[PDB]
Structure formats: C-alpha cells, structure tokens
C-alpha cells in the first residue's frame, strides 16, 4: 500500500524524514559510565558507533512520543489530552487512541517524522503494554529508565536515532 498522498504534504523542514529509537542497558548497573561514553559522541542525531562490553541491547520495550510539556502526541503533533510525569511515569488518564507509539523489534523501532512541525519533543518508556519477560528471574535488571528529549534533524546525519538509558540499580534488600 502506498500512503504518500496523491499530492504534496508536510515535510521540507528536516535533513531526514524518520527516526529509529533503540533501547540500551548495562550488565552490572554501569549506565553512569555508559552515559559518559555517549555524551562524548554526537548521539543527539547519529547511531552509536562505539558501545562498551558492559553495555547491551533489548527488543520488546514500549515507548510513546510526547511534547515539551509532557503531553502525549500523534505523528503530526496533535495532542491526545493525556500527560505523563518525568519522575513517576504515571498517566493523567487512560491509554490514547491515535498516539505515536511502538515496541522495539530486533535492533530498535522506526518512527516517521515528516508530518511533525519543526519543534522539540520527548519519549517516554511505558511497561504497561505486553513486554519481553525480564521481571521473572531473567538477565534483565528491573531498573528505572529516565525519559528522553529530542529536536528534529537539521544535521548532516544519514539516518536519525535515539538511545534511552537507566539510572537506578538492582535492589540490595533481596537475596
């Protein structure tokens, strides 16, 4: 199916028309050194060229796109009447209809940006839709993720990408 429209729509505001959002994790809570191993790179736009051996990648996480006042938006910038705390990750209401959301497939997840206007945006990582089995004694940590901020590509990159990180570590209470 061709969804390009029978005439000209949106666009002409960026150097690329899509973004791929990934998910990174640490092996032993190392997200702090990893985030300094990434602030040195230009990873506001381009895909991570050098990962550490204390880093790893995971498919089957869910995330939603939002605006700078933490409102849930559609893939053209219309706001759905729902908001999210950066600290609590709680929703001001129930799950939206047309909102901009997807899960990681095998390396990441694609989001089309051509229909967004030239502005700043955010991404929130919601474990409320059925995810990969980490919480059942697996090699996953159960650490809290922190939210992402992004501005649309006006940069010499070949493709745009995103790298969400954690900042909490495993509990010391449980044996």
Contact between 132 and 59 (Cβ < 8 Å)? yes
Beta bridge partners of 150: 121
Tokens 């497939």 locate to: 105
Contact between 11 and 5 (Cβ < 8 Å)? no
Q: Nearest CA to 65 among 119, 143, 10?
A: 119
Contact between 9 and 121 (Cβ < 8 Å)? no
∠ CA 97-101-105, rounded to 5°: 135
1-175 CATH fold: Immunoglobulin-like (2.60.40)
Contact between 115 and 9 (Cβ < 8 Å)? yes
Q: Where are the domains of the chain?
A: 1-175
SS3 of residue 121 by DSSP: strand
Tell me the C-alpha distance between 93 and 97, whole Å.
12
């Amino acid at each position: 199916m061709e969804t390009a429209s029978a005439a000209t729509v949106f666009a002409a505001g960026t150097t690329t028309t899509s973004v791929t959002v990934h998910k990174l994790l640490a092996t032993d809570g190392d997200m702090d050194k990893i985030a300094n191993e990434l602030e040195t790179g230009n990873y506001a736009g381009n895909k991570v060229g050098v990962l550490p051996a204390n880093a790893k990648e995971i498919a089957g996480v869910m995330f939603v796109w939002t605006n700078t006042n933490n409102e849930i938006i559609d893939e053209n910038g219309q706001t759905l009447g729902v908001n999210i705390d950066p600290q609590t990750f709680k929703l001001s209401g129930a799950m939206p209809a047309t909102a901009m959301k997807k899960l990681t497939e095998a390396e990441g997840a694609k989001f089309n940006t051509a229909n967004l206007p030239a502005a700043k945006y955010k991404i929130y990582e919601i474990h409320s839709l059925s995810t990969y089995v980490g919480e059942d004694g697996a090699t996953l940590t159960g650490s809290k993720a922190v939210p992402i901020e992004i501005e649309l590509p006006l940069n010499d990159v070949v493709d745009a990408h995103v790298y969400p990180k954690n900042t909490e570590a495993k509990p010391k209470i449980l044996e």
